[PDB]
Design an enzyme around this catalytic site. Structure first.
Site, short mmCIF file in Angstrom:
data_model
loop_
_atom_site.label_atom_id
_atom_site.label_comp_id
_atom_site.label_asym_id
_atom_site.label_seq_id
_atom_site.Cartn_x
_atom_site.Cartn_y
_atom_site.Cartn_z
CG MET A 50 -11.59 -2.30 4.41
SD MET A 50 -10.12 -2.21 3.66
CE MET A 50 -9.35 -0.97 5.21
CG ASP A 94 -5.54 2.02 1.06
OD1 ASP A 94 -6.91 0.69 0.38
OD2 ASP A 94 -5.45 1.15 2.35
CG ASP A 135 -5.79 -1.81 3.13
OD1 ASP A 135 -5.29 -2.49 4.24
OD2 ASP A 135 -6.68 -1.97 1.57
CB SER A 154 -1.04 0.45 1.25
OG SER A 154 -1.45 1.14 0.88
CG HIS A 210 -4.03 -1.65 -2.16
ND1 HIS A 210 -4.47 -2.39 -2.74
CD2 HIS A 210 -4.37 -0.54 -1.15
CE1 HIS A 210 -5.54 -2.09 -1.63
NE2 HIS A 210 -5.00 -1.10 -1.05
CG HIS A 220 -10.19 0.44 -0.87
ND1 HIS A 220 -9.08 -0.19 0.34
CD2 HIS A 220 -11.23 -0.01 -0.91
CE1 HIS A 220 -10.46 0.22 1.23
NE2 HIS A 220 -11.34 0.20 0.74
CG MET A 240 -11.91 3.33 1.99
SD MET A 240 -10.52 3.35 3.19
CE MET A 240 -9.06 3.47 1.38
CG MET A 242 -8.80 7.05 2.21
SD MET A 242 -7.82 7.40 3.49
CE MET A 242 -7.04 5.93 3.72
#
Ligand SMILES: [Cl-]
Ligand SMILES: [Cl-]
Ligand SMILES: [Cl-]
Ligand SMILES: [Cl-]
Ligand SMILES: [Cl-]
Ligand SMILES: [Cl-]
Ligand SMILES: [Cl-]
Ligand SMILES: [Cl-]
Ligand SMILES: [Cl-]
Ligand SMILES: [Cl-]
Ligand SMILES: [Cl-]
Ligand SMILES: [Cl-]
Ligand SMILES: [Cl-]
Ligand SMILES: [Cl-]
Ligand SMILES: [Cl-]
Ligand SMILES: [Cl-]
Ligand SMILES: [Cl-]
Ligand SMILES: [Cl-]
Lengths: 218, 218, 218, 218, 218, 218, 218, 218, 218
Positions: free
Chosen positions: G137, G34, G173, G7, G32, G66, G68, G36
């Site tokens: 998650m 993440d 994750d 990540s 990866h 991913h 979020m 947000m």
């Protein structure tokens, strides 16, 4: 021991300390706060300063907070700091249910979830370790008569509770009175929130005694 | 259509025709007779001549007889001849349950069984073809508050009824009032016997309307 | 803790207080009364005045009454008033089982049902809330050797008891001795009534110790 | 081998020995006695002296006694002593079912239970070891046409019998004739009591042969 | 009787009364309104004044409203007052699903829930008593070809409907045409919303007849 | 309402109109035609012209055709055109079962399948939508006594019928008489074909009344 | 082959290309992201331009996104156009889950759903055909230690995946490290996102090798 | 309360009393002895005199003995006499498992079985009454990393334990550390043996606190 | 990869090689031959010489033969020798199903069974090892619209196929078109025979592309 937890929303808000002290002296167990923010439900009730005021008045009984608000984390923190002994919120009201339950528990108090009449119990599955109690709403929050479809929900939640081997309180709130309390209790409910049935009666003691009498026979 | 069948044991027995006519005009469906012989239960109520008297007075509504007597065949015959439209008796009260059900049916009227709180539903299995209705007692006959353990029994009898594909009325008698009627109805009960809740109220019409209102939401 | 409850029917009825005091000093838990009215079973044993006499003599141990009588309500009342700590009766002996259990409980003592060898456990289903104990008869009451078919019944009643989550004592009476007690205990039985095996032995202490030894290994 | 056991209640009671000898010579297996005491059922038939009279007449065939009486122990003893080879009674007629079955077996003969149309099979569960036969009543005893609901009962009793691994005869009595016997036999029934169908026919031999023919094809 | 309910979103919005009158004369059952607020789905269609306009034009056929809006209560009220005969909304669009269903029913009309393709049927469980119909979306609302994964959903909803014993209409909306309608109907769907397939065809009558022909063979 | 459908194969074929008119006046429901082509079964009975002749004679009652022929399509067409109200055929007799059922239904009449004693019910599974009735043969077609193994088949077909939620008539043909009709009816059969039992009796009215009497008690 | 997908949120954001190139040279599989938006979770990380920058830098490895964020469609499009090889989002974050999955797939890349700790797997049921991967998650997103309750969720998702017969990657994750990775892998997880455990270690190669070693023994 | 039981095999064997006293002062519960005889496993550790030496040194904490020896009875006796509070052994190591468990219990201490990774739980079935604890080996005894396949075994043993209604401790030994302890605990394990993770750490207190912190969240 | 196999019965039989070459160039997979002998179904189509003619013309694509003939062995041999790559026949058409499947396989080609709409899947059970493919008929062979009842059959055959672990192609033939193909494919069908939908369309390429597009989304 079955709990009878009067809801202060039905109490004399102009003489709250006095009314709370009286209901506790009459046999009540914990004081229940139905907190509404005018967004999650269509009314506004009371904030954490009302709970703090009751602590300062000398009320030492448990104070159970039901958050009918969205979002929920800021109010979890302020109600906990004011002196709440338990806090429950609606799963639909948080974008991080597990985190919100953990937040409640970080204050060393009881955490749980409240379920609207339409809401099922799947939300309890993966957050089990952070559930100390479940609150079943038996009326449409912030809008009545007990919704009879909730008896089967109470039975299903009781079964789930038994499968966990943990001590999880099963509470109900909405239209509870001396005439339907035994019928709800046989479904596995151990805690009863009552507002009108208690606070609008001529004698808190006699009403609470009638309730205890029905409950003792379940 | 859910039935509300007032029990005349709670009516003005000195002005029975008048009280019955009034309750029917107020929305009641059938008139219910709780017949006791001081042997099967510890009181004595009324015989077939009271039912005949109501027929002669001009009451044309259904007249449902619940025999809390032992033995039962002679009274089945006299109540049928007096004008009963249905008769139920307790399985424990007859040494020939099937024959007693057949006897009732030989008069061209509805037959069935009444069950004390402790009594299970195995008695219905082999006499199914002669069962038009089942009466659940929710208080200890001839001696109260609704016995909450009867909700599950009503659910089990509803299930059995569904498995038969026959139209079998599921009725309940004992401590029924406007505050617990919806909770009983969600369990599959379609007919409600009420005595005190109706006959001791200020307005039969308003009480029956309140009941209908709760029932319409199940 | 497994109970050993000697049945006084086998004791020295001419020196009852003395024999009871001795059996209790030797390790017995409660004193058991097998009450027979010559109608429900073919013998007559002792009435409530014998229990009262033992209370007046100074016996403070629990006094468990097994009513092998029909009907049962008058004797429930007199045995309760005499000082019984538990009363059980046979379902077939009352026309109002639930009412009879409630009557026992109205005296603040333990209530339950006793089952003849042929009698199944369906009678327990709807009166569960009023059952504190169940008594399995393992001989034909008032007429022997332990009836081995009762082991499976004890297993089925244990299972039912577990499903209720309530504390319900499972007791057995009939032909219990040190040689078969462990075999009965592995089936879920927690209380044992023994008459002959204890009262006809040379040493109550040694007999009760032998029983305890077998039970400690289950 | 399927049994055809004529019921003597339909025979020529003025020439009983002769009629019994004839039915046995025509192919019947055992002689069946439907004993009624005017209390358990509403007629009175014959006592043990009639069975003894047939033994003295020289009848050596099996003599099966069905006790439709209450209570039952005195008659069990007198019918056994008179020469019965099997005795069955109704569970509802004895306050000590297991003891009554044991009493029958103490005479070295077959014991069992007879079931009224409404009566289920739970009574067989715990007395299994003392059951050599079961009698299904297919008419209302002492009052007809075969009650078709009894086919499923026969199927359920057959299943129970198979689960025991014991040889237990399954018999039926009430409205049996050559036209419905095959339909009853496919449900597991191995013994048939017939009265009218045999004794009122022109030829016992031809009637019994017709029955055998239908049975041989099941 | 299977319903064919044309969706007016595909009709001639400049001559709506005329187009609606024509489709009804051609065999359509009810008129369907797919109401979008540009928030719950990414388009805006028509408000309650369009439904009222059709009532004033003289359309007496049923008018089914599908609310693809969030929140939903104000529009439930205005569409009901305008003359809707049924209203369905998406569970995700209301914070008080049970209250919203009750609101619809307070107008004496049919209520229900509409489900997006990803949405399961758990939302129906506790609001069953207020569900008169269910609408399955078979395309992504407000954005196509029928989504075949919806056949199994229709089967699961049919099963649920059967388990309730209530009459609940099962409807589908999205990409329905004469070539796939029979395949959807065998899965338990009783009502079909079609827009393009009907309103863009040369002959409403012939299209509706083709649909009826396929449906009659299921 | 249970149907009694006399089979004309047993009627007076020289005065058929007269015999049919008489049986209908005596309480029969529909007239049953067992059609045999000497190939599928070893006899030859009657063709479509006999049915037409009865229509021309003025018989307006339903006319049910059972085709024990192979192949079946030409006869489906001619019997339909002659005035049949239902037609059933054997699955083994058509190489295109679904097409043959559809052909029957194309005439606007009832279609179904007839099953020989050895034939199971798997043939009904995929043609369900075209099944309005099922005919169980309880004798070997064209060759007797009712075959008792068919009771369980009737039970299995009843169960299948219940699982479909469709109204499918369950009929039986072969050796039906007043003595076995109730036993067949308790297995779920709603229609009975009888030939000999009715047409060879002294009074059609009395025979049909006896049948109705047995059926009314199931 | 089990994937180890570092990540980048834990990487050196000031020398991202260099750190990514190094982790891939050390044995990592995919990179990866993440993502947000400060609304769905309480932090803001990086937009599609960071992914594009890595593509321009020459990184050719898979880039898993991913989301979020809420809503999600605009970011699905921009991340896809920037060069993402897979995109997952949370079901609660889209009002049209199926449409959002289809949108991802319209770019010819892998689509799937990410589940918060409290979120169950019912959301996967009806969108199965558009699910190429699932992300569990195991920490509260945007706020830790691996949440052990997620092992059972991984087992349940593995079972669901097996029932589909499709190749669906199961990824996890949150708090993954060399000491708990084998315990997670035995539950059916095939892809592991690790941030801190890899990027904060002295040697990416040694850390990734330790992980591979534990995984090879599952 | 979850137990943390340090394994002395990893302690300072030259200053054992001191190291044990320190680990207990740091929060450890019981002291664990992994006893090996060089035959059942390929190493030799310590005999009963080491346990006695710790008792003489003043250690009063529980001392749990895990016998990885074969045969086992002589060592059961010597470890019990030296002061062990619990002893477990491997079923494969005794030719009389029940007798060996009884021997342990004859000393008034806890008995149980230890299971190698390959060993299933069938060995617990018939010796249940003599099982106070079960020890799961999560590494190959006397030869590592925790074997992840043991999580499911712990789940299966937890289930078995729940089915017994007895209090049976579930312990694990092999490769336990702060990073995998929570994952093991969610599977039902209540006691943890740790050697290296505790005794080789800089601070026993901090390591034990980290473990407690993870465990408190399960 | 889903197969699209055009049925040549709908092609230009006067320019067959040309039409086949064109459909294959447009994206078709295999060429399908629906062979009828005027006996098993009521039409006659084409013999093995037509298949040979296509091989001689240069068609190298797979040639799938569906034998709607009875008997089948001679045609299995001639079609195999002509160049068929698969042959399926109807179980009802052979008196030795296993031998006929083995015969097909003796030519080194694929074998299987074709099922009429009414035909169930029991025929596949014991010949599993010789089944490479199954053909579901979705219209009445040799006589239409897709028969929707076949979707469930396809689901049941898919399940059976999965239980075998063998690669068995599931094909369907009858009324397949671009509008219903996706609905059939979600039921587990991997191969589609289409005649009219392809050969009567303006563009084979566009029709086949539309089909592929729907299939790619299942
Ligand atoms: Cl927040
Ligand atoms: Cl979360
Ligand atoms: Cl009587
Ligand atoms: Cl009876
Ligand atoms: Cl009494
Ligand atoms: Cl009672
Ligand atoms: Cl007696
Ligand atoms: Cl007894
Ligand atoms: Cl709103
Ligand atoms: Cl709500
Ligand atoms: Cl034909
Ligand atoms: Cl066909
Ligand atoms: Cl969006
Ligand atoms: Cl959607
Ligand atoms: Cl040894
Ligand atoms: Cl041993
Ligand atoms: Cl051949
Ligand atoms: Cl063969």
């Amino acid at each position: 021991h079955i709990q009878i937890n009067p809801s202060i929303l039905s109490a004399d808000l102009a003489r709250l300390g006095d009314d709370v002290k009286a209901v506790l002296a009459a046999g009540a167990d914990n004081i229940h706060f139905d907190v509404m923010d005018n967004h999650y439900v269509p009314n506004l009730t009371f904030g954490p300063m009302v709970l703090k005021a009751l602590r300062d008045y000398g009320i030492t009984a448990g104070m159970d907070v039901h958050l009918m608000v969205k979002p929920v984390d800021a109010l979890i923190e302020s109600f906990a700091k004011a002196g709440a002994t338990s806090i429950v919120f609606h799963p639909e009201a948080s974008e991080h249910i597990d985190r919100s339950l953990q937040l409640i528990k970080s204050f060393g108090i009881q955490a749980g979830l409240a379920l609207n009449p339409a809401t099922g119990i799947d939300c309890l599955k993966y957050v089990e370790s952070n559930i100390d109690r479940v609150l079943i709403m038996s009326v449409n929050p912030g809008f009545q008569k007990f919704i009879p479809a909730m008896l089967d929900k109470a039975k299903e939640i009781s079964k789930w509770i038994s499968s966990t081997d943990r001590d999880i309180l099963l509470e109900i709130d909405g239209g509870v009175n001396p005439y339907n309390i035994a019928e709800i209790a046989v479904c596995g409910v151990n805690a009863f929130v009552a507002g009108s049935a208690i606070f609008n009666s001529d004698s808190y003691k006699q009403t609470i005694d009638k309730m205890r009498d029905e409950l003792n026979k379940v």
